[PDB]
């Protein structure tokens, strides 16, 4: 029942020049987003990724906008280390110990996401997820990163396997991750394919299956939420809180 | 938390509206009904009221003329029909048509039609409304007494108690005060226990939702869905909505998520 901070998804490439992604990043802030999750990915490339970030990064910092960057490459990550973005989203969970001490000299909060790319007993995935967090958080702490800087993401959708039951189990049991490590947790359900396998609808185009899962996560204590339609979630969270 | 029926709103007057001519497209309303049903609607809430207040005998026979083809066609396909009208002459036409529900936003205040309502097998949607700056607490108390007096006067005439569905009213029907709508939304389970009757919640696209967020809720679904979700988990028996598919798809997520 805690107020969740919204993460606005802005993809730099599919929106673009830089201005179409910039104006998409301020319209979401004008809609109730606390942090803008910047993504700039194409096909097949470190300089190409960074070149699209620099104009959007410092433009949002010129207006005091908290920025999250979705990158799994350490060279792109070390760039975000010294640009001093407020968040750095890694869908791989920092598996390369090269930049470990590099992440300790910084202060940007780290987001530790877990995935399991093939046979899914849905609870066995949860247990190994508990052990994955226990080993990766410790090694990050041993490298100098403060424990108060890690945010856990249990993964969702195709990051948990083609089985929709796996994503349902984690959506019901993510409070257990909250109290086992005493740390914040973000849930990302927006337009993920497994929502269509439950309702039989055209995902990526239907907001309501998506909205129902984000309110459920908010009502169970999710600290952060990652979505596309921000003004829809912002109004869903305003109604949900005022309604008791 | 449990079951919930969905009322599909079909404004026959709106589906036959004015793009440069009025109330001759009697098939758009019929297609809007059959559409909403394959989106997950349980009952079709037909509404053929005039665009502006009309209280003559012509507006009566005009309301039946807009309901007569839509009611008939939906009957041939086994569709639960609910008529959204507050006129006694229109309601008597719905009784002889064997319509499933009669949705009255005035709470049936005319005793002349009580005789016709007793013989009917249709269910009744008794709605409560407000006088016209009343404190939200006193609106709830007067609503309780209003249901208590009107339910008795209906069973006195011969309407079996179990056919009465209670609607507390929402938004402008409770006043321009948003907290009055919030109080009813978070305290309506007290209605189902005091009267042991079903309760219908109708929040779809009401102005008070915009006063809480600050967005145009008349054409948007997110605040309508958030409020419709809360009433579902709180045990609302029926749900009157516009976007049936978005609510039906939403109910399929909460049922899987538990
Ligand atoms: N933290 C987090 N980030 C993501 N980035 C991209 C995508 C692709 O949908 N998913 C996610 C996600 O599920 N969680
Ligand atoms: N049963 C019921 N019917 C309504 N009809 C029209 C309108 C106006 O939107 N409201 C309602 C309502 O709140 N409850």
Residue numbers in the entry:
A (entry chain C): -1 to 14, 23 to 50, 57 to 129, 137 to 263
B (entry chain A): -1 to 130, 138 to 263
Structure paper excerpt:
The sulfonamides (sulfas) are the oldest class of antibacterial drugs and inhibit the bacterial dihydropteroate synthase (DHPS, encoded by folP), through chemical mimicry of its co-substrate p-aminobenzoic acid (pABA). Resistance to sulfa drugs is mediated either by mutations in folP or acquisition of sul genes, which code for sulfa-insensitive, divergent DHPS enzymes. DHPS catalyzes the condensation of para-aminobenzoic acid (pABA) and 6-hydroxymethyl-7,8-dihydropterin pyrophosphate (DHPP), producing 7,8-dihydropteroic acid (7,8-DHP); this compound is further transformed, ultimately leading to tetrahydrofolate, an essential precursor for DNA and RNA synthesis. All three Sul enzymes adopted the (ɑ/β)8 TIM barrel fold also shared by DHPS.
We determined the crystal structure of Sul1 in a ligand-bound state, and the Sul2 and Sul3 enzymes in both apo and ligand-bound forms to resolutions between 1.74 to 2.8 Å. Comparison of Sul apo and ligand-bound structures revealed conformational changes in these three loops triggered by ligand binding. We noticed that the Phe residue that is conserved across Sul enzymes (Phe178 in Sul1, Phe179 in Sul2 and Phe177 in Sul3) and localized to the active site adopted different rotamer conformations depending on ligand binding.
